[PDB]
Amino acid sequence: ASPFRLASAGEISEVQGILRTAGLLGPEKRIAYLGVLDPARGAGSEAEDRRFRVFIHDVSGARPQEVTVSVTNGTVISAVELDTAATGELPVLEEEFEVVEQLLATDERWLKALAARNLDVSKVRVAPLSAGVFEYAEERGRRILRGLAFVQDFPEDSAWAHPVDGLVAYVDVVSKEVTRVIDTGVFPVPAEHGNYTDPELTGPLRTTQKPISITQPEGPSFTVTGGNHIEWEKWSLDVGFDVREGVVLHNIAFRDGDRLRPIINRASIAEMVVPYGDPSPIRSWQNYFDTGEYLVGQYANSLELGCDCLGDITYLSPVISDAFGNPREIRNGICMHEEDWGILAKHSDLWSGINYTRRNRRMVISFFTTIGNYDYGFYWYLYLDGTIEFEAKATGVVFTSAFPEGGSDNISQLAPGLGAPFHQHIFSARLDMAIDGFTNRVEEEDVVRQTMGPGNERGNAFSRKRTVLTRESEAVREADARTGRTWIISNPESKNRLNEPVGYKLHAHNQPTLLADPGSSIARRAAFATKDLWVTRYADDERYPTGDFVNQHSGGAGLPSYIAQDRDIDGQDIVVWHTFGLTHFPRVEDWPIMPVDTVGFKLRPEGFFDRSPVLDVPANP
Amino acid sequence: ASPFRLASAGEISEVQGILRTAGLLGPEKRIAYLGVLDPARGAGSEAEDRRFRVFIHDVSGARPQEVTVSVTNGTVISAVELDTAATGELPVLEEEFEVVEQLLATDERWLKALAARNLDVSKVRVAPLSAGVFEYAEERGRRILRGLAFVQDFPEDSAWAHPVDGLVAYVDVVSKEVTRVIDTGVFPVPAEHGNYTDPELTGPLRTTQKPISITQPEGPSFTVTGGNHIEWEKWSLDVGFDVREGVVLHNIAFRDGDRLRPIINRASIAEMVVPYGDPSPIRSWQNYFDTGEYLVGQYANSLELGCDCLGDITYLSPVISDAFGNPREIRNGICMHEEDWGILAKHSDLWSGINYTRRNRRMVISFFTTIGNYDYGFYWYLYLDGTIEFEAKATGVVFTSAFPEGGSDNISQLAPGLGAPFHQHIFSARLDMAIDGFTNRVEEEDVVRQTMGPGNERGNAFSRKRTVLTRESEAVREADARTGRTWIISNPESKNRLNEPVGYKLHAHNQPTLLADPGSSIARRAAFATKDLWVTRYADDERYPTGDFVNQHSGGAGLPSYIAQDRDIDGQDIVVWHTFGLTHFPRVEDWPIMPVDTVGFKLRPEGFFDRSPVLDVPANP
Ligand SMILES: [Cu+2]
Ligand SMILES: [Cu+2]
Ligand code: NA
Ligand code: NA
């Protein structure tokens, strides 16, 4: 069967068994990451070796281990002890989140700070947040979470409406010690509630919305075979799932007549970073890498039919490992369906008398994740005409603070006394390209303005220019919306019928990239987010733009170290890393629950096909 | 009844009668433009005076006239003779398009050019195109069209596949004279056909697409009263139609509790320009202003249910005048429906245990127009959360040329010997703002990066800055995607509950603007297209960014002359003019019929509301 098939409960139980038998999974051990490894480049002699990569944490303080396991042969391949003070800590465990509030509740410094605010400790929730790397030398080599407090007036109250500003604590979650409690002063706790299901806030619900029924009376046009292989309207792909990256698309290819033509070997969101722009000591450390530090797949929602996914939905229910190696199913974690997408092509020709209209549609593959106050949707779209699009949907409840009485240059006021610090949500798409095969190159395409003069006497001409990126050292590129800058991924050895190299064009949204000072800690750890486009030469171990162990790593790992190798990328197996993000200055309308905002990118064919690939679409029924 | 109601067949017949009785519409006269005038600013003492503006052409060569007519009182208000050599020619008449091919067919120079190419004149179609203003002094004061030739091998053949390059003719359509025929040389006529309904090209049609049924079992959630007044999900607006601008939105307002709050007084696409970037003498003159020169509303398609508009559709059938003053109905010219739009807001809260999901939807108002080879869709979207969005969809058949044998820097090759010149499609949105009333101002908002240092020791802070545009002379603005530049329209005298001015934010796509040399003819006539944003003080006669008479006008009219008045726009009745466009380097995939590409803009509330306006949306049925 397919080596790209989803992990099954049996494979995960068998990994647990192999590890136990090898002496690697005793009672002090916890699995912080488990995922299948992709087949090797040809080296994997077809056959089949289902290999799994495991990060094992030790709750007694011993060194963690990276282990690779073969479940086909039931053996441990390698087990390396990690020096986390050098190469970074493991991802946060779910059980460590719950520990922060409990420890703080019995710490004299925390209780004193709460008493000075006349707050009941049984009503104070603590958001446990990743720690980053700053000036505290005692944290190097230690698993640290930081806590910010919110008041919950009653169990169904939205705590985010009641931030306790001026207060932050740092917690060692392995030795279970409170290392620091910082109290810069008392701020009023905002009193208005933010309960968006309370009739007192919502008013009477609308009665004016009539139903929209979307049905497919003959079922959907896509087929699913082998659990996760999709065929739809000439597209072919495998839908993977990884506890860290979430949904991963493999082997995206398009059937152009008789031949299956590869386009993208692997597509994923390989990292995301959420940096905050509030210089207050209470929050100036606040950054999370939701993918690399928390593992966004682990927090995927079960998606409800008619609510989260409307229409004729096919579901995938991926299996991940819990902290002890037992399989855990995310029921209805992935939604797949096709959607009408308006007009595809249209022309009414006067001379021929032919009127022609065809409708477009797209395949949708999506999942949603929730981490704390944030909710992120990840949407991959495939269109009839060969376009591939990614869209992130950001929603949830904004992270709050007090609003200072004299105003602020870095915080929005949402309600009396209630602030929302400025922040970004930045994503890194990793696109292991395979445009008609693995010999690919990237060109930067700019519009070129021409001057009125000889050969252009009316001053109307304009053109474009393409610059080939030949080595990694020249392949760190910035957007330029004003010159219409795009990037083309082409195959110099595969030509269309016009004898031009086949290609795909990447259209970015040209949003601002990382705003932090280039000397900041976050600029070093999130270096990928400072540029719009990176191209690297493929390597099996270069998976994430931040490195493998993002939690509490000092920085520089990942992309800036990969590109220092200065490898040849001109007609080679290459990987495109695209940074794109939202800059969020929260508005009153984002409160008390925020409407979705979106960002993404798209790839459109650029002389990939010999003519329009949608000539054979029939007239609408 | 509403003074914003659509013109009726009776009103148009009555305009015809008034003009006839006044001696203004005899047999030598033709109506080149007819449209209702909007109610005056308060000055219109409610009551009702339905006034119509008429451009009357004279086919005997006498001077044309601008006439304003009151159909309520059955009188002519004013009739002015136009000096078209000074102020521009009238819009092209449909009957003048048909004249170009007929005249050329009996001209010895044209027949000689066709004979030298072994072409049969009965198979040569001539695209009649607007002329612009260049070096030919004989054209000043004359109605000129230029013709480019295409070969049609048989009546149902797509002529666009067979351009006759090296040949162009100029025609005086009033005296019916061929002024010039230019033959720069013989080019092979591309032989491959481009017939996208021919089974030989399409192959067997797909059988894999299963139906998508979109129904509203209880009917739609919007109501239509008075012919064209829409109420939908707290939105209120009137849908107008103008033969020049096409669909016009009036009185866009949102019901926020008890009060109806204005947002936009009038929204339209007030001009569009399609400049070509090929420096060949055969085409370097090629620019059209489809709105101002051709009148895009006049060429609106009748939209077929299930093909052009899918779902539960409500139709409007606008009435326009033909060239003699008879009413002509565009049946099913406007489609209106609501569409599901995925998730609106979502949060699963761990501390409260509440899981919350709400679905979004949008109201869609659209029309399609066809001029020659081009087909343009105009889409206005209203969303539950207060967002307003415009989207243009460009499709049709690309305008073609020969592909030169040595290559070209300004033309794409689509097929053997077949070129497609580079061009842009640029739109001007005119937004007569009324944010909570008519005292509005515009601010330019830029992201501000901050340096690591005192008060920002971790180097994470970032902020933003808003610059008020106080006079027209400072209100010609350029995009800056890198600093996240947007524009806020606010009402300094209307505050939200946080005592901040209410506002709306304009989010542009930041595509390139007009690429032509600033000294070119098109840069002067399409000056609006050289900048992303203009703000003017409202005036009843400042309707179009190019002026009233765009056909063969020398330039400088419209926006650059309006803003020279340097009026106060700080808390005044203002109008926002946003330029946005597509730069089209045609691809092989655009041939032989092109998939839709899109561009547009959106406005999102920015502290307009006191909290999220969609708290009262119910859970999905
Ligand atoms: Cu945000
Ligand atoms: Cu185009
Ligand atoms: Na690759
Ligand atoms: Na206004």
UniProtKB/Swiss-Prot annotation, chains A, B:
The keyword Metal-binding applies. Topaquinone (TPQ) is generated by copper-dependent autoxidation of a specific tyrosyl residue. The active site is at D290 (proton acceptor), Y374 (schiff-base intermediate with substrate). GO terms for molecular function: copper ion binding; primary methylamine oxidase activity; quinone binding. Induction: By phenethylamine. Substrate binds at residues 288-299, 371-376. GO terms for biological process: amine metabolic process. Its EC number is 1.4.3.21. It is an enzyme of class 1 (oxidoreductase). SUPFAM superfamilies: Amine oxidase catalytic domain, Amine oxidase N-terminal region. Its cofactor is Cu cation; L-topaquinone. It catalyses: a primary methyl amine + O2 + H2O = an aldehyde + H2O2 + NH4(+); 2-phenylethylamine + O2 + H2O = 2-phenylacetaldehyde + H2O2 + NH4(+). Cu cation binds at H423, H425, H584. InterPro entries: AGAO-like_N2, Cu_Am_Ox_Cu-bd, Cu_Am_ox_TPQ-bd, Cu_amine_oxidase, Cu_amine_oxidase_C, Cu_amine_oxidase_C_sf, Cu_amine_oxidase_N-reg. It holds the Pfam family AGAO-like_N2. The modification 2',4',5'-topaquinone is found at Y374. Keywords: Copper, Disulfide bond, Metal-binding, Oxidoreductase, TPQ. Binds 1 copper ion per subunit. Disulfide bonds join C309-C335. Homodimer. Belongs to the copper/topaquinone oxidase family. PANTHER family: COPPER AMINE OXIDASE (PTHR10638), COPPER AMINE OXIDASE 1-RELATED (PTHR10638:SF86). Catalyzes the oxidative deamination of phenylethylamine to phenylacetaldehyde with the concomitant production of hydrogen peroxide and ammonia. This is Phenylethylamine oxidase.
